[PDB]
């Protein structure tokens, strides 16, 4: 559901002694992992995680792997600099993360660009929607912000986000089309559970759907109304979700669940079937 997107989620975790950090880069197309690099692998290289990525030849994988080697060193030096900004103990455990990517518009051009960092799981510095200014989240990030405003680092990222990011996302959508167009509709059912004297829980299940985007609703006599669980992976590439309501005993037939999902020609409507 929504605009096509590409994202790269990168992490470096410092390790003890003279050991270099562990660096992991994960790429996503339309919220599904499609490439991965892990410095802990026997032979570290970017690998195709979506099988349609095997349409890319050896030069692609070499180029991306060389880039990951560069990112790993950028993260290593950046972690060392952060240690000094926060006056922290060296040889310790620390995490640096980056998110970057693009959403596409109806003209196949950039709709929104993303470029942000976190240290110890907290916002550090982020490129604003204008792709020109920076949001420094705390006082140490002011050091980076001044350095990057003076060096013009935003211009480099703006060029990547408006150019390469958009162009490669379009290429991947074309190559992955046969897979990316295949949707799995949710299979839904309502279960009935003892709750109290006079009350029953009705739980509306949506199982085995792809993509993850879904809406579950409950209505009483056609009017909107509820416990929801976070959408969760089934383990086979599809997802699950449920929504439950507490209902008076004898009024179960007055409630309807509606499931909205892009794989469905029309939303599903169902009720408790004794």
């Amino acid at each position: 559901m929504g605009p096509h997107s590409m994202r790269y989620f990168e992490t470096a975790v410092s390790r003890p002694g003279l050991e270099e950090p562990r660096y992991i880069s994960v790429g996503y197309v339309d919220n599904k992992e499609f490439v991965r690099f892990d410095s802990d692998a026997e032979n570290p290289r970017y690998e195709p995680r979506a099988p349609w990525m095997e349409q890319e030849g050896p030069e692609y994988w070499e180029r991306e792997t060389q880039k990951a080697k560069g990112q790993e060193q950028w993260f290593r030096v950046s972690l060392r600099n952060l240690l000094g900004y926060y006056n922290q103990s060296a040889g310790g455990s620390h995490t640096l993360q980056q998110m970057s990517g693009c959403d596409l518009g109806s003209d196949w051009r950039l709709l929104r660009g993303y470029l942000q960092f976190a240290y110890e799981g907290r916002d550090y510095i982020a490129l604003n929607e204008d792709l020109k200014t920076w949001t420094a989240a705390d006082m140490a990030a002011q050091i980076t912000r001044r350095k990057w405003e003076q060096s013009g680092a935003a211009e480099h990222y703006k060029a990547y986000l408006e150019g390469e990011c958009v162009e490669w996302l379009h290429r991947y959508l074309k190559n992955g089309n046969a897979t990316l167009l295949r949707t799995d509709s949710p299979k839904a059912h309502v279960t009935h559970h003892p709750r109290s004297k006079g009350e029953v829980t009705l739980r509306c299940w949506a199982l085995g759907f792809y993509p993850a985007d879904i809406t579950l609703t409950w209505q009483l006599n056609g009017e909107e109304l509820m416990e929801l669980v976070e959408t969760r992976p089934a383990g086979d590439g599809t997802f699950q979700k449920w929504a439950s309501v507490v209902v008076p005993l004898g009024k179960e037939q007055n409630y309807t669940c509606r499931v909205y999902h892009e794989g469905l020609p029309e939303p599903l409507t169902l009720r408790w079937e004794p």
């Binding site: 030096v77 550090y124 980076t144 990222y157």
Partner: peptide, 11 residues
């Protein structure tokens, strides 16, 4: 194709 931070400053 991921970003290349290397062409620009470290934190």
């Amino acid at each position: 194709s991921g970003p290349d931070n290397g062409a620009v400053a470290v934190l």
